[PDB]
Structure formats: structure tokens, C-alpha cells
């Protein structure tokens, strides 16, 4: 278990912020580590009208860097520091790694299909327009035709980045939400 001083010098959180984060983390996980199932149970209760299990699995794999099957407080604050306190490029790299399931270095259409299926599973089966059973497919199509630039059937980190900086709404979303907290 990394100490408070080492976490202070590694992450971008202050001593008070790390203490509050540890307080909450241990209040939910008294053992100091969380497995995938307890992680899903924690994450689900923010989405009372959908199924967040698949997206929670993606998050757990992304956060648990050393692939121990357990997210420790170190994994927790490392990921939270990269997302909440990192630069826009750091967040974009984190999101790209989330999408790239095999971590090979590219995003295929089926990889993005898994991600959008996980995201739409939170919308629930009883939504306003329809449960079209194809909205993730065409959303993947839109994401590719926006992100991909050489039209090679895949998304690379360069195209992901440059397409992201070419979208003002993405900038607004990055600066506002992940910096207010």
C-alpha cells in the first residue's frame, strides 16, 4: 500500500483530497481493494434505469493497470489523477485506451461496437425514441466517419487526437466537467 506522501508526489491531488478519497474508498471497500464484482455493485447504483455492467467491466480493466484482478487505492487515484487532473491529451489517451480493447494501438469497428453497446445499456430498455437495436451500430458509423481520416476502417491515436481538437464541443466537455470536480 503506497503511503500518503508517495501518493502526493505521484498523483496531482493534495493531502486533503487524497485523505477524502481514501476515506470514501475505504468506506466502500474496508479491505482497501475492490474486485470486479464489488466494483460493478458500486458503479451500478449511479444508473438506476439501465445496465452498466459492461461499461463497468471496461472501466475496471482500464483502471486496474497491473492486471491483478483488483483495483487498489493506488489504481484508483492514479486513474482519477490522469482523468480529473491530467491535460486534455492525457484524458484523450485514457479514453482511446478504454476504446482499444486489445490495447494493440487501434480502434476497430467491432471494438467501438462493444463500447457503444455498453454505453447504450445504461440508457435502459424503456427510452424516449426507441430501442432500435441498431443505434449503437450507426453511432459507431458516425464516430468512425468523424474520427477516421484516412478511411482505413480503423482509428489510430493520431486521428483520434486531431479529430478531437477539431471539435469545439469536445473541448467544452473536457474543460468543464473533468475540471469542476
Amino acid at each position: 500500500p503506497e503511503g500518503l506522501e508517495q501518493l502526493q508526489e505521484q498523483t496531482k491531488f493534495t493531502r486533503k483530497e487524497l485523505q477524502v478519497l481514501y476515506r470514501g474508498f475505504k468506506n466502500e471497500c474496508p479491505s482497501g481493494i475492490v474486485n470486479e464484482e464489488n466494483f460493478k455493485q458500486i458503479y451500478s447504483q449511479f444508473f438506476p434505469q439501465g445496465d452498466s455492467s459492461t461499461y463497468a467491466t471496461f472501466l475496471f480493466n482500464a483502471f486496474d493497470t497491473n492486471h491483478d484482478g483488483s483495483v487498489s487505492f493506488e489504481d484508483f487515484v492514479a486513474g482519477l489523477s490522469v482523468i480529473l487532473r491530467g491535460t486534455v491529451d492525457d484524458r484523450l489517451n485514457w479514453a482511446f485506451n478504454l476504446y482499444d480493447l486489445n490495447k494493440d494501438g487501434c480502434i476497430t469497428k467491432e471494438e467501438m461496437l462493444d463500447i457503444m453497446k455498453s454505453i447504450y445499456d445504461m440508457m435502459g430498455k424503456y427510452t424516449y425514441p426507441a430501442l432500435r437495436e441498431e443505434a449503437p451500430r450507426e453511432h459507431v458509423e458516425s464516430f468512425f466517419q468523424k474520427m477516421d481520416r484516412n478511411k482505413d476502417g480503423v482509428v489510430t491515436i493520431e486521428e483520434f487526437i486531431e479529430s478531437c481538437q477539431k471539435d469545439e464541443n469536445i473541448m467544452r466537455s473536457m474543460q468543464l466537467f473533468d475540471n469542476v470536480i
Binding site: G24, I42, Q45, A62, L80, I119, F160, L176
Partner: protein
């Protein structure tokens, strides 16, 4: 419910953020000094309990989680005072910290239920670890209450003796010619003057 992992969920939204097609809403101001490092004091019959304010905010619709708490605040001492039982209040507070309510087997079920009712806790939130114990004890106490409803006469004689003593105390006050006693006797004298009738000693 779980506000500790709310920043985690807000951060996890970053996986949604790039794939969204369209704008995003305005983030909340949240300008309340982060509502952190409060450590409010709940003084229960002289016993100091300390807790984070957000811990209490986890469960609104209860006394401690709502603005009803304000009825018990003492600005002079900067603490909430409750004229209640502190030992049962320990379990009340543990509920806020964990979400589950435990039932102490050594305490009276009536006292426990009265403290639950006072603080707005519903007995159905007792965890399965303690629910069978609580249900059995509540069943015995319901059985006693029903057996009484359908040794009571000692209670009845005691309450009648108490009313007779109150009437005799008012009569002796009249004969002579304790703020509560004085105001109550004034109310009884007002009743006398209303009805133009006077009480008389029962013996």
C-alpha cells in the same frame, strides 16, 4: 447513498465524452466550499458524536439527513443537542455510515423502536444479519401488548392513584390559598371559573 464514488462516476463519464454526437449540458456550480472537513457534533444527552456532514446527507427523509435537524441546533455551542438515548444513537449513526441498521440484542425492543421512530428510521432497513433477531423480539413484545389488550390492574390502580394525587394536590393548593404545578393549578382554577362550579376533595 454513495457520494464517495460520485467523483469516480463523473470521471468515468470520460469514456462517453468523445463518442457523444452533440453538445453537453452545463456542469453544476457546486459552490459550497466542497462541503468537506465539517465534522459536525451531535450531542446526545451529553455524549459527543462526531460525523461528516456528507455522511448525514447520504440519507435524506430522515431527521439527521434533512432540515428537521435544524430544530435541534444550538448556535451558542455550535452543536446539535438531542435529549435521547446515546447507546441506541450509536446504531442510528452507524446506519448513516454503512447504510445498514443493526439491532442490539441487549436493549429493549420498545426503546429501540421509539428511537427509530424519533430519528425517522424505518425498521425495514435493518440488515439481514439482525432482522430475524429484531423480528422475534418484536413478536414477543407484540404478544405481550396483545395479551394486555385482550396484571394490568396494578397499572390501572397506579394511574388512578396518580390522578387522585393530582386532584388532591390542587385541592391542597386551594386550601393554602414547581412552575408547572402553579400554571396547571391556574388552568384548573380557570376551568372552575368557566363552569361556575368548584372541585371538592374526594375523601
Amino acid at each position: 447513498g454513495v457520494a464517495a464514488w460520485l467523483p469516480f462516476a463523473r470521471a468515468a463519464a470520460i469514456g462517453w465524452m468523445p463518442v457523444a454526437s452533440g453538445p453537453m449540458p452545463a456542469p453544476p456550480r457546486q459552490e459550497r466550499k466542497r462541503t468537506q472537513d465539517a465534522l459536525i457534533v451531535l450531542n446526545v444527552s451529553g455524549t459527543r458524536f462526531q460525523t461528516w456532514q456528507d455522511t448525514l446527507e447520504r440519507y435524506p427523509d430522515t431527521l439527521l439527513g434533512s432540515s428537521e435537524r435544524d430544530f435541534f441546533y444550538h448556535p451558542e455551542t455550535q452543536q446539535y443537542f438531542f435529549d435521547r438515548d446515546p447507546d441506541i444513537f450509536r446504531h442510528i449513526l452507524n446506519f448513516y455510515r454503512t447504510g445498514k441498521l443493526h439491532y442490539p440484542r441487549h436493549e429493549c425492543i420498545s426503546a429501540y423502536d421509539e428511537e427509530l421512530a424519533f430519528f425517522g428510521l424505518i425498521p425495514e432497513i435493518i440488515g439481514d444479519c439482525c432482522y430475524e433477531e429484531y423480528k422475534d423480539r418484536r413478536r414477543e413484545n407484540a404478544e405481550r401488548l396483545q395479551d394486555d389488550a385482550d396484571q394490568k390492574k396494578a397499572r390501572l390502580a397506579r394511574i388512578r392513584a396518580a390522578k387522585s394525587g393530582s386532584a388532591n394536590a390542587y385541592m391542597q393548593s386551594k386550601r393554602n390559598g414547581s412552575s408547572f404545578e402553579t400554571q396547571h393549578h391556574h388552568l384548573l382554577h380557570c376551568l372552575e371559573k368557566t363552569t361556575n362550579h368548584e372541585f371538592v376533595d374526594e375523601q
